[PDB]
């Protein structure tokens, strides 16, 4: 029985050396350095369009590469594809099981996928010969429910399942290629880097890990939260990422040095965080709280600089466009709004 | 007006798409949806098999009775955390709950000190006192009765329950169990519990489910127009 004890003290002294090297490397906080910059005055953004037509809660939304088309999913069982400029609809793809919680859009605008509670990721084809929408493939190799899936390419997809694992699939063959494991809780958040070489996932127990698609093993881990991780997004540079949580606290980390840089917390908020997305130049950190309104948290100054309260229920999804022209937020009242 | 020749054709597509969406959104709004829950050995399989059927992960069962469409979501294959995927079941008419009467002297696996009725009551407390299910009624089922009678005949009831003053009679033991299960209900003004004992006749079970659903519908309609 001594082997488990010696391995446990070995891991403990390894963690001690890691935290010592982490503490010795940091000299001062980022807020102290950025004390000679003029902050933004006030971000006054008014609604422009109101995309209506859903009949249930909304759980996902993704922007196309053309910054014109967006796709949204609801518990009603539809995958409507909206047009942002003209507000007309383009498709009404139905679903087999009316329990969906994620969506994605192909970088070329060809495929659209959506998982759900039935632990099956189905991929639809939009450029078929006929006028309908067919199911190209149905991937089923996970035990727990699927939480979020993004298209790494036109032929590869990465999914985040609920059974403490993440796997990379292949569309042509239909079987998973590589599986990433190591998490202790339900993985429910991930986002791809701009160069599509690395990606990070947010565990369910105050943990965020970094994965590589080629080699396929955990490289670095970050901690510091209390409750859990609920949203992940990279910096536009691709060299940092800011994560949400449930205890009204979103933080920003660094990839080169596993250190904590800034914490965006306020004494007037005690509500969770659902979605986090950056801006075009990495200056505005939009965050959607579950207290019926959003926030325009500044990225470098850690002070609120705007409130988008035009909603009825809790917001569950929001994302900035590719060119930084507008932001779209979707709440549980089946109403999408375009802010500019 | 300002629209071009073919731009007006795209606007007509939005109209028919919205029409097809509204036509289907109304057909699925006139059917009763009810959730199923229970322990691993709570006899949920025999309940879902005994009732009429017309139809891993979630399983949906569709059946009709007295010109009503019922949907039964059996969330039993989800091994993940329950607090993450429980908010999507906010809109539901009833919550079927099934427990086993004879399952009170059988200890749970890989454990010799904790009884299964304990975690049954814990699950019932977590389901009834949840912050989402504060308005939906709960239908309760007792699966086994003859095996329960045999067990209380050969084995006393005091092994599971620490305090008991009555005799070893099924007529009073069932009433005691029902009164204990109805006690774990904090929200006593916004929800009600309908209890029933599963028998060999499927017609009685289907009739009880239909009666409970009709009562919930009547209460909802009365509370809709602010009449009571």
């Amino acid at each position, epitope marked *: 029985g001594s082997e488990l004890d010696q391995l446990r003290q070995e891991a403990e002294q390894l963690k001690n050396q890691i935290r010592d090297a982490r503490k010795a490397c940091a000299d001062a906080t980022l807020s102290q350095i950025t004390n000679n910059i003029d902050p933004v005055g006030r971000i006054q953004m008014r609604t422009r369009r109101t995309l209506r037509g859903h009949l249930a809660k909304i759980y996902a939304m993704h922007w196309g590469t053309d910054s014109r088309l967006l796709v949204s999913a609801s518990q009603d069982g539809k995958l409507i594809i909206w047009d942002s400029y003209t507000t007309n609809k383009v498709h009404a793809i139905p679903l087999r099981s009316s329990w969906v919680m994620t969506c994605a859009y192909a970088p070329s605008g060809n495929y659209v996928a959506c998982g759900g509670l039935d632990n099956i990721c189905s991929i639809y084809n939009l450029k078929t010969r*006929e*006028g309908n929408v067919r199911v190209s493939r149905e991937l089923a190799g996970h035990t727990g429910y699927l939480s979020c899936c993004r298209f790494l390419d036109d032929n590869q997809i990465v999914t985040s399942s609920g059974d403490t694992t993440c796997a990379l699939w292949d569309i042509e063959t239909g079987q998973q290629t590589t599986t990433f494991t190591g998490h202790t809780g339900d993985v429910m958040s991930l986002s791809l880097a701009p160069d599509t070489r690395l990606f990070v996932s947010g565990a369910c127990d105050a943990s965020a890990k970094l994965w590589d698609v080629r080699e396929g093993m955990c490289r670095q881990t970050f901690t510091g939260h209390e409750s859990d991780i609920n949203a992940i997004c990279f910096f536009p540079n691709g060299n940092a990422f800011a994560t949400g949580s449930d205890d009204a606290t979103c933080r920003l980390f660094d990839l080169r040095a596993d250190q904590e840089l800034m914490t965006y917390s306020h004494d007037n908020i005690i509500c969770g965080i659902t979605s986090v997305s950056f801006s075009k130049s990495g200056r505005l950190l939009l965050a959607g709280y579950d207290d019926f309104n959003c926030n325009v948290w500044d990225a470098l100054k850690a002070d609120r600089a705007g409130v988008l309260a035009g909603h009825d229920n809790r917001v569950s999804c929001l994302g900035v466009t590719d060119d930084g022209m507008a932001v779209a937020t979707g709440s549980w009242d089946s109403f999408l709004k375009i802010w500019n | 007006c300002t629209l071009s020749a073919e731009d007006k054709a795209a606007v*007509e597509r939005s109209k028919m798409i919205d029409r097809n969406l509204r036509e289907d959104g109304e057909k699925a709004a006139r059917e009763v949806k009810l959730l199923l829950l229970g322990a691993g050995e709570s006899g949920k399989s025999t309940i879902v098999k005994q009732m009429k059927i017309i139809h891993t992960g979630i399983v949906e069962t569709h059946f009709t009775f007295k010109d009503l469409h019922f949907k039964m979501f059996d969330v039993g294959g989800q091994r993940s955390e329950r607090k993450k995927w429980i908010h999507c079941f906010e809109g539901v008419t009833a919550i079927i709950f099934c427990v086993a009467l004879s399952d009170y002297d059988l200890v749970l696996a890989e454990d010799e000190e904790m009884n299964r009725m304990h975690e049954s009551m814990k699950l019932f407390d977590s389901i009834c006192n949840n912050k989402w299910f504060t308005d939906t009624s709960i239908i309760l089922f007792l699966n086994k009765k003859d095996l329960f009678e045999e067990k209380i005949k050969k084995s006393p009831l005091t092994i599971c329950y620490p305090e008991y003053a009555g005799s070893n009679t099924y007529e009073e033991a069932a009433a005691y169990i029902q009164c204990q299960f109805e006690d774990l209900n904090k929200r006593k003004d916004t929800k009600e519990i309908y209890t029933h004992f599963t028998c060999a006749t499927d017609t009685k079970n289907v009739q009880f489910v239909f009666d409970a659903v009709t009562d919930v519908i009547i209460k909802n309609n009365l509370k809709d127009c602010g009449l009571f």
Partner: single-chain antibody, 232 residues
Framework: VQLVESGGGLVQPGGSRKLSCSASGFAFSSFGMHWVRQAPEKGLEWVAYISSGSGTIYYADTVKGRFTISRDDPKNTLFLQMTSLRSEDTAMYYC??????????????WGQGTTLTVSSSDIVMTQATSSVPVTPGESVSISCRSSKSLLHSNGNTYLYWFLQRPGQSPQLLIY???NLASGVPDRFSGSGSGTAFTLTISRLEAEDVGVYYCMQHLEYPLTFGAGTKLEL
């Protein structure tokens, strides 16, 4: 997909026969239908259109009030009836599917066509020339001119372009100003400014010869060109 025409026979003046076409292999219930009349040794001209769901029915100014047309969705069959018939209605008849949304390709699949023989403001679009002699392996430039500015306020010209093989039905080549259609090689390219449009071909082979046409879609009364022939 498959399309075929039926109801082709010699009809005396003053008599009427209905035209029927059957479509199978796609969702006919969500495709608009266009009819196209092709006179012998002449350019083809638009005839009629029906939208998805029979919501908007349009006609041409020449045959207005004289042709009755309808759709049958359950059987995927299209019908065309006329009341009066004259000596100039002797021409080929084609049907072409078209669906209009963001990023769509109208007039994608042309029908086979039938033969009909009879025995007895708007946009002006004129092509450059009637025929050009071209030796193989040389670039060709074809110019189609219009009398109006096709460029709309949205920012996209509405001048389509397609080729007709000798003895077969024409096929779409290039929608809008530049986008290439599906299935056609990338040799064909087009450009424009708003008034004068041109098309350039990189390499020319023997399997792509015939006549060319340029269509307009800015204002609804569609008009085609005269038709420039390519000689091998």
């Amino acid at each position: 997909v498959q399309l075929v025409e039926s109801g082709g026979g010699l009809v005396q003046p003053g008599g009427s026969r209905k035209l029927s076409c059957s479509a199978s292999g796609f969702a006919f219930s969500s495709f608009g239908m266009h009819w196209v009349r092709q006179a012998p040794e002449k350019g083809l001209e638009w005839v009629a259109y029906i939208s998805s769901g029979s919501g908007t029915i349009y006609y041409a100014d020449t045959v207005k009030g004289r042709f009755t047309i309808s759709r049958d969705d359950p059987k995927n069959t299209l019908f065309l009836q006329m009341t009066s018939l004259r000596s100039e209605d002797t021409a080929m008849y084609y049907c072409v599917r078209s669906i209009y949304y963001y990023g769509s390709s109208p007039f994608d699949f042309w029908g086979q066509g039938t033969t009909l023989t009879v025995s007895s403001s708007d946009i002006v679009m004129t092509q450059a020339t009637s025929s050009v002699p071209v030796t193989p392996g040389e670039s060709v430039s074809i110019s189609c001119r219009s009398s109006k500015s096709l460029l709309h306020s949205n920012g996209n010209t509405y001048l389509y372009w397609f080729l007709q093989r000798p003895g077969q039905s024409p096929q779409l080549l290039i929608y809008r100003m530049s986008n290439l259609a599906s299935g056609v090689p990338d040799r064909f390219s087009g450009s424009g400014s708003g008034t004068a449009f041109t098309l350039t071909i990189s390499r020319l082979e023997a399997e792509d010869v015939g006549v060319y046409y340029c269509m307009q879609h800015l204002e609804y009364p569609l008009t085609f060109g005269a038709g420039t022939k390519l000689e091998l």
